[PDB]
């Protein structure tokens, strides 16, 4: 039966039938958003969904016989597996992000369709060249997040009260998001020199970030 | 008479006459801005305006006899047709954007003056090589926009209450506009973990955009 | 006496003496900032200031005899004349920005010291290659500034009430400065679709600007 | 005994033992952030800290015998000396930033591990080719900071009242942070033309910054 199904699975029809369902379930998921649409055709699309979920597990079963070990060493397939598994965790119990994480199956449109895979791959490939810098920065953040917690967290605990809070705030300063009127002018009403912490933080972090883009512009 | 007008239309004088009108009609449109000016020369200009609109339909009519089918296959010519067409819908009925969309005719200074054609074409030409990325992202936006509507739309309906609302908010976060103090800090007073949605969102989207600029800086 | 002074003017000591005065006068101007310093040594400083202003006119007089026409065809010389000229209009009358525009003489440090000249020249030289795009942009801004004034200036005159206000507001959206929570979200409370005006505006302008940087990242 | 210790110090075990304390002390410093953690194990980790602080002085003492003058001409070594010395200044007297500056020792993970060393060095190396620009800019900032103090500091002392405040505010406009709704729109309520100061300042400064990135994307 193997070559029979290996011929079904590898069929152009099959790959296109899946791509056809993704665009439908994506279109159908934009509709589940509408409280109006749901009052009318809610029962329709709850079923249609569970239907596609089966079809997708059947496929993942079919795809596994045909590829076996080869399949659990394919990034795009591994993905597809975990993304369908999520969609299988009952519409109940645990966390309800699991109900929400179901929308991640629409990323299969990236998986199932080449050129996308190409483009995603193109992107992902740039990351290893970035890991030295990314490491450097995270060390830097960690170091500064610590200083700030112990320098401003007493008076300013919303923003710096906890190590995690300082991380969030420092991230916000890095994106240069409302950094002065939002964080540093306030801080300075109590700690006049806080500028001595943040201006250097800004230079270094933006400098590094310029460098990193230039590196991605030469590899 | 065909060649008579093909020599009128194709004449340098004809083109320079048109360009001359555009600059005048453009100057006059900055004047229609002044409620003061309109109270004095308001009548002067409304007529000046209907005049140029005629002169331009005459030209488009002329330009078409000289080119026939070659014309409705020229971007720049097609443009001026539709742009002049907008300005033909009577000053009344329907929507009032049509009255406002008239000033689109000043883009004819781009259409009728070389160099601008060069630069605009330079620009437009870059877009095809971005279509793979642009799609990747729009798929991404669509996915996240759905996640956010169902994760935050009950408590935060201004920002995430509807799929389209979420598009806009997500757009704003992506342009890194007031994202933390404006949207996520508020969100977190109710959903402590919202940062788990927006920081990853910020990374991907900022990553992708650097790559896109670096790609353009290759092609 | 000509070659005598041409040997005075062209002397290393002369130039270095001038550069000496620039850095001294520049330091003195930072001190003129202090309301304290001025109560103490304000008199000390205003005389030294007028002294420097004399010396500089003397120099500029001398420099011209030694170059004649050659001088008023030197950008950097023209600058120095026009900068020293500003500092010559008496401490009284007309516009008082003239008292303030005096501090522009510290740009003589760019003018009198090479390498700076190099760097400045390096920068300025990039400009000609940008003028087609800068023209493109100004036309774009002019067209949208007009549309916005007539679409929004009635309900929102602070931001769009006048052609000039719209220019300013459009510039601000372009710097992506507080654009959503500051301008468009407000606008939309009255004009739900204003997003159809600003998102396209934002795309084009940010596109064009990226193109301009890559263009510069090639020449 | 020299070659004995020169074989202790230069050993793989030595180097990797130091790296072990850094990642341990660094972990231990994130924990001293928690006032919870400190209420239970505060005793443990103050001593652990003093332990590592001894070990680091012992090590720095050892490393100096092995290198003598060669060491005080190594940037990376000099660093570790200063950073350990900071951590020696008693947990008392003077200022409290010295207690806080202790966390700078976690930068030894950069110093004591290559690739980091490489990356940091790669970055720093880019700096000297920026110094003409960095200098140019600081002249410009100083000039405009002076102008602003005398144009806006009377009515607007929080933002432009003092030379240093003008520097800070100018920095913020340069990072394009809340500049319009935060500073210039306000300013314009009193000085209508303030846009004539900040728009040019924005152009020059944003221009220069683009040039500097393109420079770094050449060298």
Computed over alpha carbons, the radius of gyration of chain A is 24 Å
Per DSSP, what share of the residues of chain A sits in E-state strands of 2 or more residues?
under 5%
Largest sheet of chain A: none
Q: List the chains of the largest interface with their residue counts.
A: A-D, 31 and 32 residues
Q: By CATH's scheme, which homologous superfamily of the largest domain in chain A applies?
A: Voltage-gated potassium channels. Chain C
PDB class: metal transport
Keywords: Tetrameric, Voltage-gated Ion Channel, Voltage-gated Calcium Channel, Calcium Selective, Transport Protein, Membrane, metal transport
Assembly: tetrameric
Entry title: Structural Basis for Ca2+ Selectivity of a Voltage-gated Calcium Channel
Question: Characteristics of this structure?
Answer:
homotetramer, 2 domains, Four Helix Bundle (Hemerythrin (Met), subunit A), Helix Hairpins, mainly alpha
